[PDB]
UniProtKB/Swiss-Prot annotation, chains A, B:
Keywords: Cytoplasm, FAD, Flavoprotein, Metal-binding, Oxidoreductase, Phosphoprotein, Zinc. SUPFAM superfamilies: Flavoproteins (SSF52218). The gene is NQO2. Uses dihydronicotinamide riboside (NRH) rather than NAD(P)H as an electron donor. Belongs to the NAD(P)H dehydrogenase (quinone) family. This is Ribosyldihydronicotinamide dehydrogenase [quinone]. Inhibited by melatonin, resveratrol and 5-hydroxytryptamine. GO terms for biological process: quinone catabolic process.
Length: 228, 228
């Protein structure tokens, strides 16, 4: 069998993002996959990296060190329940799909917070123990991104540069760092200015792609892919 | 006269980041600059983009569109006061310094949320009115970033690749997009493994740089600079 986690970051269920998430649930479920959705806004996910992320502290340390404390907390199974619930979903997933609108050439802050807090030292990677040696090796990940800008704007000659450029910290610095193999991104450009028919086509294209997702080869998640 | 805003994202006042922020306040204050610090964790800054960002009644209360609602709220002077307070500090600043530890090759989520929520359409940019025509034109911005990884790890052939690569979404996609001129980044590598005196040297180097900050030329914030 195959298990899929969709990490979804949009406020509005009727949005284009919400439609992309729903068609992924519907297609993957039809195939007989196990599917789970983390709807970050609906969960009111905490994005801040704070001492609340470590449970069971009787007396605060004089000096708070988020990196040291969360690494230790992971090993002691004393992370906050929201984090460990997400970690269980990741641990079990064969494929993690991130569904989000592009915000400032990156993920919305609530999703950045999921990355910062969930993908902790000892769980997702170790030092050393990263990139191909990351702890989530054997899993796949995919970014499904929507944009304001058109595909042409996101070319090397366009004002926003190649779309691949902004993908580097996400695909490579985050997903590959943790040991994921990365499937090619699904970028749905400029739905807001698209016709109704074009919008429906972008949704259908995603659904169609998912029919054969388990047959895809990952990208070579290298500097050449992103910048060459 | 000159006005400086430091947008600071670290949980711990005794941290290396805290020392870099404090030396910036000390040196810029000595020069006679007006200095303000936004201590995001101390302020418990909201990172999530939600309908709480608009005060009062929404334009469309049935289907929530963050971009539309915040642009209209900006125009109607109906944004939440945390956002408007930040916008006043930015509007008045000649230089905005971001002081943060690198988190997943980007800003911590709390700082990402500052960018997402404060730099709204109508305030920071318009369409048209972006890149060099952005609404924060005539201002400078600087990233002062600390890392886990060493300088060697941040070369083209190093394990994490060139540091410039992941600066793109921040420098270009955010700061240049809003009209800032970008000063060369201050990257303080691997303080945690440095000796005490090496750390003191990195703090002194930052203070020294600030002495002559107003004499610096911006970088050419191009794809070529980041990836060539
Ligand atoms: C803080 C912030 C930062 C941003 N930064 C960037 C950036 O760096 N770069 C960039 O390019 N953009 C940026 N944007 C723009 C943002 O990426 C886009 O607005 C977003 O991707 C649009 O997706 P959506 O789901 O919100 O669209 P929606 O407005 O929800 O969708 C568009 C239309 O599709 C309709 N729709 C929904 N489902 C379907 C369906 N099944 N079939 C047909 N139509 C359907 C909706 O009803 C709607 O009319 C930013 C936006 C914000 C708020
Ligand atoms: C979620 C997360 C994601 C991360 N992602 C990345 C990543 O993508 N890439 C990467 O390279 N790193 C990453 N890191 C590592 C992170 O960037 C570093 O741990 C951080 O930059 C270290 O800065 P600090 O201020 O926390 O250090 P500290 O631990 O505060 O500094 C070291 C020491 O300096 C001391 N000190 C303070 N002031 C002074 C002074 N004036 N003189 C001398 N010593 C002083 C302190 O007391 C402390 O003992 C990540 C960390 C986390 C938690
Ligand atoms: C020119 C066209 C539109 O291209 C675009 C739009 C947004 C683009 C873009 C290219 N590159 C970047 N951003 C950004 C960047 C930051 C934003 C911070 C807040 C809000 C934004 N949005 C909200 C939605 C609104 N419709 C546009 C501004 C933002 N957008 C119309 O077809 C392409
Ligand atoms: C090998 C050396 C250390 O290099 C490094 C460290 C972290 C590096 C790195 C190079 N590239 C990336 N990251 C990351 C990435 C994500 C992280 C998500 C959560 C926590 C992290 N930190 C917390 C602090 C801890 N000391 C290290 C892991 C993270 N770090 C020791 O001198 C260089
Ligand atoms: Zn990679
Ligand atoms: Zn630029």
């Amino acid at each position: 069998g195959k298990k899929v986690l969709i990490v979804y970051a949009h406020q509005e269920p009727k949005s284009f993002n919400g439609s992309l998430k729903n068609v992924a649930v519907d297609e993957l479920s039809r195939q007989g996959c196990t599917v789970t959705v983390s709807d970050l806004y609906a969960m009111n996910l905490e994005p801040r990296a704070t001492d609340k992320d470590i449970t069971g502290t009787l007396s605060n340390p004089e000096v708070f060190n988020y990196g040291v404390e969360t690494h230790e907390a992971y090993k002691q199974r004393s992370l906050a329940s929201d984090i460990t619930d997400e970690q269980k979903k990741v641990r079990e997933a064969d494929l993690v799909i991130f569904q989000f609108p592009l915000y400032w050439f990156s993920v919305p802050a609530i999703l950045k917070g999921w990355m910062d807090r969930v993908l902790c030292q000892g769980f997702a990677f170790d030092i050393p123990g990263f990139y191909d040696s990351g702890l989530l090796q054997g899993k796949l990940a995919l970014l499904s991104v929507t944009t304001g800008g058109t595909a042409e704007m996101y070319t090397k000659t366009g004002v926003n540069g190649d779309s691949r450029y902004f993908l580097w910290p996400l695909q490579h610095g985050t997903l590959h760092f943790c040991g994921f193999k990365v499937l090619a991104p699904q970028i749905s450009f400029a739905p807001e200015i698209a016709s109704e028919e074009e919008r429906k086509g972008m949704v259908a294209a995603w659904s169609q792609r998912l029919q054969t997702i388990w047959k895809e080869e990952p990208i070579p998640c290298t500097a050449h892919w992103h910048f060459g």
